[PDB]
Design a protein around this nucleic acid. Structure first.
Lengths: 141, 75, 141, 191, 61, 49, 137
RNA sequence: AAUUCCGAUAACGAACGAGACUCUGGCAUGCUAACUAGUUACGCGACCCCCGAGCGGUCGGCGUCCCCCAACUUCUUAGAGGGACAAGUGGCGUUCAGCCACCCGAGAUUGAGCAAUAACAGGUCUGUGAUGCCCUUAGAUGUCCGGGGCUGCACGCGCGCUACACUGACUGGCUCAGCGUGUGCCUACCCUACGCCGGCAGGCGCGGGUAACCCGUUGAACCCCAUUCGUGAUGGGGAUCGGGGAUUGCAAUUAUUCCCCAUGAACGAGGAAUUCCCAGUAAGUGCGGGUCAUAAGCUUGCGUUGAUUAAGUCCCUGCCCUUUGUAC
RNA sequence: UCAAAGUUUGAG
């Protein structure tokens, strides 16, 4: 039972938790202080967000490989209330997507592929697929 | 006419009202609780989450926008 | 010899290309089971054909589907079409034309859209208004 | 599931209409009643096509109203399901039967058409088409709910459920059922 | 006393602004009896109006 | 037919109502008792059928 | 839980204890949902608490972070008054202090009879927006 | 729908318009087709690591790594054909022209473009090395350089955006488009992947792209899914203004744009009045092109989500024909 | 099977 086979919401939850239990990701010093994009009015409520984003990042990489930072921004994109002028797309934070990718690099979940960007790595492919199995054996529901 | 001043508390007489009355409604939504009592809305929601973990009210549905609960499940 | 039938469904600009196959009944789309796809309020929609025919018919028929284009709701409505068309195609070509007709009847009496496409498509804007038929506000005085 | 379709949950069969007139323009079972109240469904082709559309989907579409909620059908489907879930808790019986009963006793039976009459506007009262009574009922009550649910801590769904219940019952408490009796009464006042 | 009345023949769309269909009706209780009256909304040959009054019967308007 | 069902008399002929309205020109022309006509038509003094 | 404060008086402003804490603080001039949330996250507070809980040591602890953001690693950027002309300081101002800083800037330019000053003085639109049509009071 | 037809007939036979036409949209497991499409299902030739299920085989999943001496054209692109004509059945109709319904299947009706005669003293002499007359013509009404101004604000109006929140807001997460456009230029420059630096605006390195080749499976928004908030001008709203920071530029002060913190106004759905619109339409929603060193609250296109209501009438507002009256 | 609806550069 691979990860595609699973309800991706409840996956990234266990992935992040997995990444928390391991306790060797590398969350930077800002974390608390930083917004997460020019979109956002605020920072995240979930204080351990980094664990969550890494997961989503790794779980994307399982799905579409070779995805650089630029790639990551466009994925982590959305609406930009410009107040009294109308709304637009805004690209997510470069650095948080760079740091996540460098943090998953240090774990050896990911590796920089030929033709640029990151692809998630075999030893990584293990882990995501492992926790997919976990979720599928949560219960018949 | 309309001005409403809601509670944000574990405030004795209400707390008795929840734990006595609330589990013998057929609709137990925080909206229904907030109207009955003068309880905030956030307060209500959490209270109804406490009662669920206690087991005194059934879960119907637990959706983004609206949570539905029920009477104990009598027999 | 293999019993392969590539068929497509359609809605707006979504091409769902189901692919019926001499298999053991999967029915999974892009690369994951029908139980997700994940607009999810529109799940029953893309179960309908399977519920209306029963697993008996799909049983020994594996269906891989690929979608692209359109929006979420369309895409569904395309695959919805696709597989139920594709099954009908499968039965025609390998099973028997009495069975095809039996099925086709049981799809139509529910809904004509499960096989026949909406020729409807987004109608072009003409200047002097924001859309097609609507015009911009006239001032007068 | 193959022989009989439910509505996700609810029973389609054993939903009895009473008024032999809404009968045929309430579409809750010919046999054809569906799983979901979504459906691409081009029932705006010809004049009466609309009537063979299922009443729940008709309601669903109506719900989806005012600026923001334009073409937000899921948004509104979710509502319809929750209202129904609330109805089954509160009232019991099929929420489809209750919805139907609203439609029956909620839209007017007579109405006042604006005829010219010289120049200063004085109407004459007329009957209403069965389809017109269902259209009204549908939108009246759907609007009723929505109008209630603005600045109050109450779910659309919940108010939608409460309206459908107090319309199904001759309550004089639904916005619709009250609105219905107004019309008729005016309608009488220039018959 | 409410009476149901089956619609036998749409006559023609009257009303000021084009609205109230002039409509010939059978009377359901006793089909022998038949009024003509004006109706709002889309009507068609064969369906049922609920008339509250049943002794009024319009003509030109 | 309402009346002939609720008659005392078996059969009964039912009477009529004889009225010689006079109209002034305006009043005719207004209530459409008489239109205007073309130069040809004006001359042709047959009643309408 | 917690049966105490409910209403709160800090830094000459009030605060609703009955409000949630991040969104309660913001009632002080010179702190917004950003800076509050930060100031609390440095303080290490169960920010799902209402402000009508929260021990008086904690509200002191917050205030100290709030007044002294740079000592508690609330960085450059998150500071309304950076490199402030009158002395080489970069910091956050709070309460009536803020308003006084503001008045000292509009004074400064009024004293310089600067174009901006003058348009403040005259009570106009200052950030060269058009005014034929708008801001009529 | 049509001065479109049937028919009557001091008219007969013609011409323009209308229609036909062109582009478009929707049908083609039929044809021609492809390494700048897909591949397509295979073969799985595999890799690949336990990648998973599983004691192990056999499956599930993609990433892809693939060429060509695999196999095609369902999806793709776009050619040439086809295809619907009110043709078929039943009504109604001088049993003509036609109209209604229904079968099969798009049901004559997808939507644009072009578009008569005769006008208007409509607009344009600031689009033109189209141009009459008139004016000026070196102390210029030619031209160029600097500077300002077209942005000025008791006020009145017109298109517009954003709102007034809970069907919502935020905060995370999941997840789907289509039309285009793009440097190496008519006078100086584009689109941008990837990797580092920065919270961010951006900065610095290397690459691809005159393009179905790279940007780019254009990983859009709304929508969906969990968050919190809780009817409080509240976390709705984001005007106003202070402080700093980025870029475009020869230069940005009268804030060029951009980011950050702080500030937090009116506004709780809007009088009388009136606009626009009937099907993938309105409305929502984003994304392209235009201008563009810098760049959209405008517009011109695109798709995505997707209704209520009509299928009618001349009440108003208008138009087209007939007869009539007219001191116009 | 009839409510109210007055006026219109001197500037060619």
């Amino acid at each position: 039972v691979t990860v595609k086979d699973v309800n991706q919401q409840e996956f990234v939850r266990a992935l992040a938790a997995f990444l928390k239990k391991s306790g060797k990701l590398k969350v930077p010093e800002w974390v608390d202080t930083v917004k997460l994009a020019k979109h956002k009015e605020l920072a995240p409520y979930d204080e351990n967000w980094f664990y969550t984003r890494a997961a989503s990042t790794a779980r994307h990489l399982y799905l579409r490989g070779g995805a650089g930072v630029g790639s990551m921004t466009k994925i982590y994109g959305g609406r930009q209330r410009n107040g009294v002028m109308p709304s637009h797309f805004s690209r997510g934070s470069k650095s948080v997507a760079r740091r996540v990718l460098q943090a998953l690099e240090g774990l050896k979940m990911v590796e920089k592929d030929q033709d640029g960007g990151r692809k998630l790595t075999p030893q990584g492919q293990r882990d995501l697929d492992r926790i997919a199995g976990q979720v599928a054996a949560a219960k018949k529901k | 006419r309309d001005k409403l001043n809601n509670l944000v508390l574990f405030d004795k007489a209400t707390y008795d009202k929840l734990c006595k009355e609330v589990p013998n409604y057929k609709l137990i939504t925080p909206a229904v609780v907030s109207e009955r009592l003068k309880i905030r809305g956030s307060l209500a929601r959490a209270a109804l989450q406490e009662l669920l973990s206690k087991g005194l009210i059934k879960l119907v549905s637990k959706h983004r926008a609206q949570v539905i609960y029920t009477r104990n499940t009598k027999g | 010899p293999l019993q392969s039938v590539q068929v497509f469904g359609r809605k707006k600009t979504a091409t769902a290309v189901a692919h019926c196959k001499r298999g053991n009944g999967l029915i999974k789309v892009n690369g994951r089971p029908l139980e997700m796809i994940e607009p999810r309020t529109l799940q029953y929609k893309l179960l309908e054909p399977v519920l209306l025919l029963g697993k008996e018919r799909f049983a020994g028929v594996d269906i891989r589907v690929r979608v692209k284009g359109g929006g979420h709701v369309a895409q569904i409505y395309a695959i919805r079409q696709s597989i139920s068309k594709a099954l009908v195609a499968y039965y025609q070509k390998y099973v028997d034309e009495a069975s095809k007709k039996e099925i086709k009847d049981i799809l139509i009496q529910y809904d004509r859209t499960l096989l026949v496409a909406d020729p409807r498509r987004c109608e072009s804007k003409k200047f002097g208004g924001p859309g097609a038929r609507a015009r911009y506000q006239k001032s007068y005085r | 599931t193959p022989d009989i379709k439910l509505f996700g949950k609810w029973s389609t069969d054993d939903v009895q209409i009473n008024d032999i007139s809404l009968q045929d323009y309430i579409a809750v079972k010919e046999k054809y009643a569906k799983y979901l109240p979504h459906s691409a469904g081009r029932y705006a082709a010809k004049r009466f096509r609309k009537a063979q559309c299922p009443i729940v989907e008709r309601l669903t579409n109506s719900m989806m109203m005012h600026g923001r909620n334009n073409g937000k059908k899921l948004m509104t489907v979710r509502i319809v399901k929750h209202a129904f879930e609330i109805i089954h808790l509160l009232t019991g019986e099929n929420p489809l039967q209750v919805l139907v009963n609203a439609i029956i006793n909620s839209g007017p039976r007579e109405d006042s058409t604006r005829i010219g009459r010289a120049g200063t506007v004085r109407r004459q009262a007329v009957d209403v088409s069965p389809l017109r009574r269902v259209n009204q009922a549908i939108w009246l009550l759907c609007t009723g709910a929505r109008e209630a649910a603005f600045r109050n801590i109450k779910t659309i769904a919940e108010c939608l459920a409460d309206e459908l219940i107090n319309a199904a019952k001759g309550s004089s408490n639904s916005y619709a059922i009250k609105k219905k009796d107004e019309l008729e009464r005016v309608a009488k006042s220039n018959r | 006393p409410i009476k149901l009345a089956r619609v036998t023949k749409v006559i023609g769309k009257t009303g000021s602004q084009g609205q109230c269909t002039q409509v010939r009706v059978e009377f359901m209780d006793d089909t022998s009896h038949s009024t003509i009256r004006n109706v709002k909304g889309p009507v068609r040959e064969g369906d049922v109006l609920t008339l509250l009054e049943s002794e009024r019967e319009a003509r030109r308007l | 037919r309402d009346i002939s069902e609720a008659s005392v008399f078996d059969a009964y002929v039912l009477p009529k109502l004889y009225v010689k309205l006079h109209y002034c020109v305006s009043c005719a022309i207004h209530s459409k008792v008489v239109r205007n006509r073309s130069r040809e038509a004006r001359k042709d003094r047959t009643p309408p059928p | 839980p917690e049966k105490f404060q409910h209403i709160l008086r800090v830094l000459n402003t009030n605060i609703d204890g009955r409000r949630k804490i991040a969104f309660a603080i913001t009632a002080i001039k010179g702190v917004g949902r950003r800076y509050a949330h930060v100031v609390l996250r440095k303080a290490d507070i169960d920010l799902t608490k209402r402000a009508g809980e929260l021990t008086e040591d904690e509200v002191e602890r917050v205030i100290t972070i709030m007044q002294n953001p740079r000592q508690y690693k609330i960085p450059d950027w998150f500071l309304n008054r950076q490199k402030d002309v009158k002395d080489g300081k970069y910091s956050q101002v709070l309460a009536n202090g803020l308003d006084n800083k503001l008045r000292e800037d509009l004074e400064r330019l009024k004293k310089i009879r600067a174009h901006r000053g003058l348009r403040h003085f005259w009570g106009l639109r200052v950030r060269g927006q058009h005014t034929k049509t708008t801001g009529r009071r």
